[PDB]
Amino acid sequence: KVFGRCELAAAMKRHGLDNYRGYSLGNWVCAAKFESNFNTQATNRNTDGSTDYGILQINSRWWCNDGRTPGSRNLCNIPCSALLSSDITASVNCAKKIVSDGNGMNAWVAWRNRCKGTDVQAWIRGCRL
Ligand SMILES: [Cl-]
Ligand SMILES: [Cl-]
Ligand code: NA
Ligand SMILES: [Ru+3]
């Protein structure tokens, strides 16, 4: 599923991301924009042999099991394929754990390089929430 900008903002709020660990909703939306272009089915292979999955490109090195990432952890306790679903629950639940683990949203390098410090509120501007 490719979400609409406002459609995702709403979905994210419904699923509890708005201000989760102090990160306003626009942060989450901007991160999803640059990680996956709002496509739940986005996958990208990392040079280390891990893969990133879904709307927030969650990595199989630490967070989900894909069965082909040597020496890796599955800290969110899910198959990485659950992160590709048109239902964002597993993505959101896992993102809450990731953002809680110490570095905040800096875990998402596109967030750090492309969203952090910007007018992230523009990403939710106009949306019925
Ligand atoms: Cl594995
Ligand atoms: Cl933080
Ligand atoms: Na893994
Ligand atoms: Ru503004």
From Swiss-Prot:
Residues 1-129 form the C-type lysozyme domain. It is found in: Secreted. Substrate binds at residue 101. One of its GO terms (biological process) is cell wall macromolecule catabolic process. It catalyses: Hydrolysis of (1->4)-beta-linkages between N-acetylmuramic acid and N-acetyl-D-glucosamine residues in a peptidoglycan and between N-acetyl-D-glucosamine residues in chitodextrins. Belongs to the glycosyl hydrolase 22 family. Lysozymes have primarily a bacteriolytic function; those in tissues and body fluids are associated with the monocyte-macrophage system and enhance the activity of immunoagents. Has bacteriolytic activity against M.luteus. This is Lysozyme C. It comes from Gallus gallus. The gene is LYZ.
